Amino acid sequence: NPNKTPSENAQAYFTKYQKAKNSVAVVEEQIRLAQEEIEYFDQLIQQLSSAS
RNA sequence: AGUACGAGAGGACCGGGAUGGACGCACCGCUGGUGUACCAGUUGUUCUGCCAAGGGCAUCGCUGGGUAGCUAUGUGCGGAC
């Protein structure tokens, strides 16, 4: 257990936790957007790989 | 006093003790400088009739030292409480 400033280390841990829960929101949103992009790009690969 | 402070690295305020730089005031007793009526060596010519010994001139002829005085680059002291 740190450290020179004994409360700000625990407070830094608690801040990392708040950033972590905001990350739980935003990275799930980004995963949803990324699977939508991969589905659209796989479709674009299919439509480029020949047709009409 | 590696004390306070500081996670570490680092690092005191205050208070004591030495040693310096620059500047200044004195003075030679040391270290040196100079010291043209001090001592010695030595070259050329002239003179004291000659040898020897000396004198004159050649930057004090030149060279090696040097008393007193004057000196700093030398020494003592000051800006302390």
UniProtKB/Swiss-Prot annotation:
Residues 5-52 form a coiled coil. Disruption phenotype: Not essential in rich media; synthetic growth defects are seen in double rqcH-ssrA mutants, further exacerbated by translational inhibitors spectinomycin and erythromycin or at elevated temperatures. Decreased accumulation of a stalled reporter protein. Double rqcH-rqcP deletion strains grow normally in rich media. Triple rqcH-clpP-ssrA mutants cannot be generated. No change in sensitivity to erythromycin; double mutSB-rqcH and triple mutSB-rqcH-ssrA deletion strains are hypersensitive to erythromycin. Loss of Ala tailing. Induction: Up-regulated under secretion stress conditions, possibly in a CssR/CssS-dependent manner. It comes from the Bacteria. Key component of the ribosome quality control system (RQC), a ribosome-associated complex that mediates the extraction of incompletely synthesized nascent chains from stalled ribosomes and their subsequent degradation. RqcH recruits Ala-charged tRNA, and with RqcP directs the elongation of stalled nascent chains on 50S ribosomal subunits, leading to non-templated C-terminal alanine extensions (Ala tail). The Ala tail promotes nascent chain degradation. RqcH, RqcP and charged tRNA(Ala) are necessary and sufficient to add an Ala tail to a model stalled nascent peptide; does not add Val. Has 4 domains; N-terminal NFACT-N, central helix-hairpin-helix (HhH), 2 coiled coil domains with a beta-hairpin in the middle (CC-M), and C-terminal NFACT-R. The NFACT-N domain contacts 23S rRNA, the A/P-site tRNA anticodon and recognizes tRNA(Ala), while the M beta hairpin binds protein uL11 near the base of the bL12 stalk. Activity of this protein is best tested in a clpP or ssrA deletion mutant; ssrA (tmRNA) encodes the SsrA tag added to nascent proteins in stalled ribosomes by trans-translation, which targets the nascent protein for degradation. Associates with isolated or stalled 50S ribosomal subunits. Binds to RqcP. Interacts with ribosomal protein uL11. Displaced from the 50S subunit by thiostrepton. In crystallized 50S subunits RqcH is variously associated with A/P-site tRNA, P-site tRNA and RqcP, an E-site tRNA or A- and P-site tRNAs and RqcP2(YlmH). Belongs to the NEMF family. This is Rqc2 homolog RqcH. The gene is rqcH.
